[PDB]
Structure formats: C-alpha cells, structure tokens
Amino acid sequence: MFEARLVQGSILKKVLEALKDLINEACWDISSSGVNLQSMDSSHVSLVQLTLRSEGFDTYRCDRNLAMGVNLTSMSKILKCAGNEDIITLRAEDNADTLALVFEAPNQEKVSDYEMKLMDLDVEQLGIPEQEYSCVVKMPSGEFARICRDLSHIGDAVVISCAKDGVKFSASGELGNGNIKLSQTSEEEAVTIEMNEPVQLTFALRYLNFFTKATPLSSTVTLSMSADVPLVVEYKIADMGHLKYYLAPKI
Amino acid sequence: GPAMFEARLVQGSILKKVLEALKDLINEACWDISSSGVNLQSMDSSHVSLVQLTLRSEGFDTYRCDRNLAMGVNLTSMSKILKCAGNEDIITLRAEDNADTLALVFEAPNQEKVSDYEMKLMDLDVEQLGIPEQEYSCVVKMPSGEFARICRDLSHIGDAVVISCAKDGVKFSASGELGNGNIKLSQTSEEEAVTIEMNEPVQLTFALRYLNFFTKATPLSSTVTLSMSADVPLVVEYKIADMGHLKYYLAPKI
Amino acid sequence: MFEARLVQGSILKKVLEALKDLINEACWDISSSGVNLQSMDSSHVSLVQLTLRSEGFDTYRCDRNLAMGVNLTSMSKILKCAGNEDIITLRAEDNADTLALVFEAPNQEKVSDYEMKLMDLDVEQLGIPEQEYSCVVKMPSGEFARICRDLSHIGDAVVISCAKDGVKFSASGELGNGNIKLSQTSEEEAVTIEMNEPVQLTFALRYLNFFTKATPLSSTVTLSMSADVPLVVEYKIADMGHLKYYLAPKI
Amino acid sequence: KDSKITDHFMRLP
Amino acid sequence: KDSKITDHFMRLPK
Amino acid sequence: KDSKITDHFMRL
C-alpha cells in the first residue's frame, strides 16, 4: 500500500502538463525515496527525467516498490478535474491495477476522488552519468520560453553560443536569420553564467518548445552544455525535486 | 397606429444571455407573446431534452401586448442580431400582429447611438407538451459555476453522470475506458452555498452531452437548482432575477 | 547608408499587423523625407498608402533613395520577436539585398538582431491627387471596427449614408437587415461630421474588416466620402504620419 | 439507452 | 459589382 | 541531421 499526500497539488497538475504532450505513456517508479519518472520521446532525440522526493510530500508511506504504467493523456484529464488549491492525495496497492486519486478543496465542502487504470509498459531505462559541464546558464524561464518560440518562426534549429560576457541564441531560415544576446546582470529574473570553456552547440527547436511547457514550475531555468553531450534543461520544483529535459545535439 | 406588441428591457443583456443559452441546443423555436409575458418551449431534435423559458411582463420596464402572437424564430439568426448589441444597451422588441418580421432596437445608455434591426420570422408548427406540477423527491440548490465545472470535468471521464442524493449531500459520478471518479458536495452554513430539501433518496443516470448544453445558461444566475424524482426528467433551473426563469428538462436512461 | 531609429517601436509592429493580411508584398520607398508605401490588394478593389516622416523617428539618415521589395508576412514574423517597448532600428545599404532590424530592450540586458531577405517587385504606383470630399466623419476607431464587424453578420455589403445630423451604416441579408445611426456629440469619444452635401454609398464589408486592423494605431478614424469615388478610411500615426485605406464603391 | 422526453410529458392538441 | 480602384486612379509611368 | 539520445546514454 502506497499513500502520498501533497497539499500544493498544483505541482502535480503542472507536472502532467509539462510531460503529456512530449511523451504519451510512461512508468511511474514509486519508492520509499519518492517518485521518479524517466522516458524518451518516440524519436529518442529527447529524454525527460522527473524527481519528486518523499520529503516534499506532506505525508508519504511506500511499503514496497511499484512500477505503475500510466497513460499521461488519461492522467492529465483526471488532474484537470482538480482545482489549483486542491490537496491531492495519491494511493495504490501492491497488486497495482488502478491508481486512486483524491482531491479535497481547502474550503472542506467538496471532495472528488477518481480511479485510473494502469497499463503494461517495459521501460527502456538509460544511464545518466555524473559530469561537470562546460557552460551552465541560469536565466528566467519566461524569457527562455520566448526565445525558443520566437526563433522557431525564423528557422527550425537554434545555435546557442556561450562566452563569459553573455549567451546568444541564433537561427536561420528561408526568410532570413536573427540573433539574441543576453548578458550577466547586477536575483529572481537575472542571468548568471558559470562558464569554464566556450561552447557552440545547436539544437532542434521543436523539442525545446515541448520542454518549455514546464515553465509554470519555476521562474528560473538552468541550461547545461558541453560539446558532443546532450543539453540539460532543468526546472526545479521547490523544496521537492526537479524536472530535467535532455536534448541530443546534431553534429 | 401603435405597435401590436412592444416591450422595453433596460438590462438588455438578459436577452443576449438567454439566446446563448438556447441557440446551441435548439436552432428553430416559437416565441409565444401574450399579455402575461413571453413563453417558449421546445425539445431538442433527439426529443431527449426540453427547454422551457418564462419571461413575465412584470420583468420588463414597458410591456403591452394587444393580441396573442406565436413567432417562429431561427435562434441562430436571432443570436447574430443580438450579438450586435452592447452589454448595457436598452433592448426594445416590437411587432405588428400577424408578424412577418420582429423588430429589435438597441439604445446605448450614453445616448450616442441607436441601432435597429428587423428579423424575418418563419412558419413552424410546435409540438407543445404538458408539464404537470409536482413536488420532487430531491431539490438541490448549488452554485451554477460549480455545477458547470462538474459536468464538464466528468464528461472526459465518461458519457453519463450518476446523480445520487441523500440529506448529507449530493454525489456526481461517471466511468469510462480510462477509469472513473465521483464528486461529493455537502451542505453549508450565501450564493456560494449548497442546500438540499429532501424527502426520499434519489439516484438516476443522465447523458452528460445534454447537461453541457444546459450550462450555457450559467451567466443568467449565480445559483442553479436541480429537482429529481425516480423515473422522471431532471429539471435544471436558472432564475432570471425577478422576471422569470429558464428550465432545462432531461429524461433519464434505460 | 540608411539608418533609422524608433524609440517607441510598438508603432512599427502595429503598422505591419495592419497590412500583412490585406497585402502580401509591397515596395518600401525610403528617402530623406521618410518612408512611403503604396499598394493595391490582389483584387485591385482596395489600396493602402502608408506615410512615415523622418521627423518622427528619433534618428533618421538616408543618403539616397532605395526601393526595398519586402514580403510583409515575413516582416511581420520578424517584427513579432520584438517587445512592445523595444527600441527598433532599421539598417540597409546602397542597393539593399537585405534589411537589418535591431531590437533593444529598454532595461538594457537584451539585444536581438535579425536580417530579412528582400525580394524583387515592380510596383503599379497610382496617382492620388488632393481633393475635398462631400462628407468626412471623425469617430472612434473602436466603434467603426465594432460596427463593420457586426454588420457582416447580417449582410456582406454596407450602405454608408451621411447627412446633416448624423451618419448611418446599413446592411441586409437572408436573415434580415439593420441600421446603425451615430450623431454629433457635445476628445477620443467624439463624433463630428464635416458636411458639404448628402452622400449615400455602398461598399463591400470584407475589405473594411481588413482596414480595421489599424485600430491600435489611433483612438480615432476619419471616413471621407463623395459620390462615385473610393472611400478613404484613415488612421493617423501620432506625430509621424498616417495610414490610409482606399475602398472602391459598388456598381 | 435514453428515454425520450415524450415518455413523461403529454403532447398537447 | 465591385468596381476596381484602377477605375478612379491612373497609372503613373516609369 | 539530429543525433539521438541513445548515442550518448546507454541502456542500463
């Protein structure tokens, strides 16, 4: 029997929105440490890895590991039926055929509760190595969201370049080309590079516009680049975990 | 010679809201004008639901009807016409007895502007229905937005809602391929409240497709009242502040 | 060679928004006095004429004439990548192959930098002399847009009638007909009618609903009418110029 | 599966 | 029934 | 051409 209570259920609502359009079905690795998801998209150009730690939940009790196969469209529909101030509670039992969700509005009169069928999945899990990165930018998520959306009208691939003065996003297409340069500043909506060596990777813009649907989870996004390694787009989830998107360069 | 029928409504948005509540559920309908007010009744083309509108003459700011008239109106064409009115306009209906057209006049309250439209009517034969008076097993009075949310949320879970009612609260439920869920309201202690008057426990099943048409009337009222008894249609009622009401009727299943 | 600077660049974004859908591609004539553009639409039923004076930019300098053929949708795409309070700058040199756009944020951390492929056009410029019009009416632009939009729900042609007291727009279709009458008043919300003799003309409404895209450029619109001649819907661009749409009448 | 509304209300004239 | 705007304005040359 | 995520991370 697994039962986790999270007062700020909006987090769980926001998480499904970030994922549902990129990956359709995924396995939810429940454990005594917390929740973990990892999956590739169907092209396997990108990978998303989710971490919710048991310390973040207001109440957590997991007696044995479960690997719940979820349809993320189906789960998103159920989370839609939850107000953004609802205290969400998850609950399953070890012979897992259904996952139970319980929404309570914090005025105490309304109590929804749903029940979602699982499915059979086999995760092609992957090994994510520990490594320092050549360049790590930490900028506002709003702006990074607009950079990627805007440049996608010029061309379908971004060139992101990085030096200790500022970072610059560029792209090209049939109609022309354009660049965007942002510098470091002088906390919340600021830009700070922790740079070690210059980098000039490019990434397909299609995917980062899926990634940036995670913007409601944090004011800040952090980028991580080295040559010939996958880029890491990181949205922290406050005092609880993170959501990491991995994007393979082209070369 | 004076108009056979002339009515002046200061809060003309009421008539804009009524036409959104209707146009998507029923396209053609019959407006019955008399000295006592306006009355319209129609089934949707599946004969599964029914709407009944009632605007008393007391509610208008000027009402005079010399003869009983029955105007066949394409509610879409009517809706287009009153979309052309501001939300604080003064709306005036006007008709000559054997009406070939209905006259609408939109007066802005600042006095800058005066629009007037004239709508062709059509020939229809209504199949009018007898609705008896009765006292219902269960009567819930919840806020209308809450009701509109529940019907829309549950409708992605499944095709049909089970409404069940005791005097602790009401429960809405549905199920489909992806799973199932249930929503439970309980009573309180103003217009965001939920009260029940209750004489015998109720549990019927209703097609949600229809209930999401009924909620187009949500702008008319903060509250909505639901009336249920075994094997008789559900009554979703929207009050039209001190003027009348708009009632949707929906038959249960099997 | 040519270098203009516009501090309130919302202006240039709005001008493109008000032209991209009526006219795909036009010629931009740049000179020392300012920008001048004239174009018909594809049907040759309407014509647009833009005028932006050098006096209105913050720094203007054009050493010689230049006939930039621009795709206006592709220009609108690029223009959307600027914020509403960005300081835009235009740049081009002798026989321009491309036009340069520079968007600067006013917080000064961001500098976007696009470059637009121009194209080859030979324009059919037309002679528009001065003339006085039997009726000119000055009303709010939001109203005239509201009226042209609503009347198209009724019928696909409008009858504008101006006389000594007020102006009347009218339409009629399969579902019925309607009239809208405005009268003189007693700044931004004022109707005024310069009447020389009565007018009653008929215009296709679908063209007018393109013209109304210029509504963000001014609180006010002025209609100019005489018998047997094109109507003139004109939106002034503050302290800088104007945008005028010419719409031929019906037969 | 749906009862029609004419199965609860009587048609007039 | 829409008149062309070239019926009210003449073309200026080269 | 895009490169893939499975060319950088390996099946565990």
UniProtKB/Swiss-Prot annotation, chains A, C:
One GO cellular component term: nucleoplasm
What does altering residue 128 to A do? Complete loss of interaction with UHRF2
Q: What is the effect of changing residue 40 to A?
A: Complete loss of interaction with UHRF2
Annotated crosslink Glycyl lysine isopeptide (Lys-Gly) (interchain with G-Cter in ubiquitin) location: 164
The record's principal subcellular location, in a coarse class, is nucleus
Q: Tell me which Pfam families the record gives.
A: PCNA_C, PCNA_N
In this chain, the stretch annotated as Interaction with NUDT15 covers 7-100
Q: Cross-link (Glycyl lysine isopeptide (Lys-Gly) (interchain with G-Cter in SUMO2)) at which positions?
A: 164, 250
**Record-annotated DNA-binding residue ranges:** 61-80
Q: Which cysteines are joined by disulfide bonds?
A: 135-162
In the UniProt record, does the keyword DNA-binding occur? yes
Localization, per the record, is: Nucleus
Q: Which residues carry this modification: N6-acetyllysine?
A: 14, 77, 80, 244
What the entry lists under HAMAP family is as follows: DNApol_clamp_arch
Protein function = Auxiliary protein of DNA polymerase delta and epsilon, is involved in the control of eukaryotic DNA replication by increasing the polymerase's processibility during elongation of the leading strand. Induces a robust stimulatory effect on the 3'-5' exonuclease and 3'-phosphodiesterase, but not apurinic-apyrimidinic (AP) endonuclease, APEX2 activities. Has to be loaded onto DNA in order to be able to stimulate APEX2.
Q: How is the subunit organization of this protein annotated in UniProt?
A: Homotrimer. Interacts with p300/EP300; the interaction occurs on chromatin in UV-irradiated damaged cells. Interacts with CREBBP (via transactivation domain and C-terminus); the interaction occurs on chromatin in UV-irradiated damaged cells. Directly interacts with POLD1, POLD3 and POLD4 subunits of the DNA polymerase delta complex, POLD3 being the major interacting partner; the interaction with POLD3 is inhibited by CDKN1A/p21(CIP1). Forms a complex with activator 1 heteropentamer in the presence of ATP. Interacts with EXO1, POLH, POLK, DNMT1, ERCC5, FEN1, CDC6 and POLDIP2. (Microbial infection) Interacts with herpes virus 8 protein LANA1.
Protein family: Belongs to the PCNA family.
According to the entry, the disease involved is: Ataxia-telangiectasia-like disorder 2: A neurodegenerative disorder due to defects in DNA excision repair. ATLD2 is characterized by developmental delay, ataxia, sensorineural hearing loss, short stature, cutaneous and ocular telangiectasia, and photosensitivity.
Q: What is this protein called?
A: Proliferating cell nuclear antigen
Q: Which gene encodes it?
A: PCNA
